[PDB]
Amino acid sequence: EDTPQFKIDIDQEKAQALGVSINDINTTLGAAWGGSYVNDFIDRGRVK
Amino acid sequence: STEEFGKILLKVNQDGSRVLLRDVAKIELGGENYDIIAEFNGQPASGL
């Protein structure tokens, strides 16, 4: 069934005015709240 | 919608005046390409 969700509108003008890139905004939101797979590392000999 | 594309914000002028996409372009639904045109007995058609 449908469920409540949290709609956030980015204001393009305000952001343009303040000089904040939309890409910095979406990465910041997405990385913080959704998580971001950056790259790999080696844990006890295995790529993870 | 064409309306939403039309109001895409391209920039804000020195004097708060705004430039939207519809101010530099015509916006409409149209074919991915316009190279093929068919007729059925002289009348406008499409087909598979």
Next chain:
Amino acid sequence: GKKLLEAARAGRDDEVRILMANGADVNAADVVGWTPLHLAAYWGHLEIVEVLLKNGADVNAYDTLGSTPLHLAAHFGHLEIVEVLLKNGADVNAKDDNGITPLHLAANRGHLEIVEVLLKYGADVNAQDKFGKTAFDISINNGNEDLAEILQ
């Protein structure tokens, strides 16, 4: 309480009455601060919006972001419910945490009938949101000419 929230969303008119005539709190709120009135307003269940107001549900109840049922009704173009709410004393100029009014929301979606009613109950056409925008500012941006001249 929880059964009323559910029944209100489901548009189950009869069940709403049962739990009314059984003492369920008409102003019960879910996790996001929505009353049965919020739910009825959002999903456009008119007959339940009336029953709830009749059984004394707070008409200016707000959710955790400051939004009222008049916001929802107006936003999703539920004209009749906007009328019902307003007659039952819904704050026509209510602002959510964004400084957004029911008029901003009606304008954005181009709900002219609703915009007229709101104005008819004295909606402040000059009211600005957190970004300084008015309903008029919105109508211009959307290129809604019909709506844009109604707001003059």
Next chain:
Amino acid sequence: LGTATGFDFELIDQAGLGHEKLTQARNQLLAEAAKHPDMLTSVRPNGL
């Protein structure tokens, strides 16, 4: 078909051991094999 008498054996790191510990274990195996000229001959690594 490898001709020879020939056997083809793989020593394996089954835990977190790493290249250096695997090499030590390999050397250990090779030294032991060399103590049985009666049974094994030319037991050698195939790699570098």
